[PDB]
Homo-oligomer: A and B are copies of this chain.
């Protein structure tokens, strides 16, 4: 397309919503290619990640960890207005793995505090993709400070299985998984700092051990449990997008399965099926489609169970509906 042709395309302003929820969108594209506009303000802020009051100096796109999910369709253009407030202390940028050229846009979006930039790229490949900040010289530091999220580029005709049959979800959730490296003092107590830069040296030392002190969903232990558990009902089709910008993960829905799982996150790669636990490598996003058949609580976890239950990588789904005794039944309940 020429610059003139692009200029004539309709524009649509999207309002982003906080993970794990996803902004309003349509699975099958409504109309021809459009320039979908998004705006995100970067917020450097303290976040408490566990019940011991442990703090991380988050570098958050749109104020959240992970950053919000942006949804467009293949061959639409995604136009992001990225803002770095003067209240922030560091330069930041954005690299969209879905984009082609200039380090995913990273080389064209370096903005110092007090600056903004507008990047436009053509979403030529369908799938879920990670996006993350990557300032030359301080790349992993920003990413493990939570400056990452993902986008979904739906096929114009919506999702399909490996045989071309349509797959239409009733609900969609975005689970961003984050590995944190929090410095400790000589007594094993996590350290606190009053400036992001003050923690750099100490954090790099923990990062080099390749051993996170915490692995969490939606920015903190318990963020997607209790009252913030994701919900669904028996019979509902749910798409669960999961990303990890720096480290491998292996999602599992206990009591359920990944009926269709685009493990590589790319829709032109046929989905694996009947999955018990899938694998998403660091630096990628993946997506699993499941139709709930049983009511009750489901644990959604990174299946290295130490990471899930000792380090924080566990979420819950609360499902309503009727119990199916054909699928499962307690013939004899626990008894002497």
Contacts and interface: CB of A to CB of B under 8 A. Distances in A.
B140 A305 contact: yes
Interface string A1-31: 1110010000000000000000000000000
A88 B332 CA distance: 20
A293 B101 contact: yes
A6 B326 contact: yes
A308 B265 CA distance: 22
B277 A273 contact: no
Contacts of A209: 211
A267 to B, nearest CB: 8
A170 to B, nearest CB: 18
Given A250-B248, A335-B116, A99 B328 contact: yes
A335 B265 CA distance: 34
Interface in A67-85: 79, 81
B208 A310 contact: yes
A117 B336 CA distance: 9
A231 interface: no
A84 B324 CA distance: 27
Contacts of A305: 134, 139-140, 143-144, 245-246, 282-283
Nearest to A119: B330
A124 B246 CA distance: 35
Given A103-B299, A326-B6, A328-B102, A279 B279 contact: yes
A124 B273 CA distance: 13
A115 B293 CA distance: 29
Contacts of A114: 336
A122 interface: yes
A299 B95 CA distance: 12
Copies in the complex: 3
A252 interface: yes
A328 to B, nearest CB: 4
A195 interface: no
Given A115-B335, A282-B250, A284-B250, A266 B255 contact: no
A236 to B, nearest CB: 14
Contacts of A99: 255, 327-328
Given A101-B328, A117-B330, A326-B1, A303 B275 contact: no
Contacts of A269: 272-275
A118 interface: yes
Contacts of A66: none
A329 B120 contact: yes
Nearest to A298: B103
A109 B335 CA distance: 10
Contacts of A120: 328-331
A50 to B, nearest CB: 13
Contacts of A310: 140, 204, 207-208
A291 B245 CA distance: 24
Interface of A: 1-3, 6, 79, 81, 95, 97-112, 114-122, 124-127, 129-130, 134, 139-140, 143-144, 204, 207-211, 245-248, 250, 252, 254-257, 263-269, 272-279, 281-285, 293-294, 296-299, 303-311, 323-336
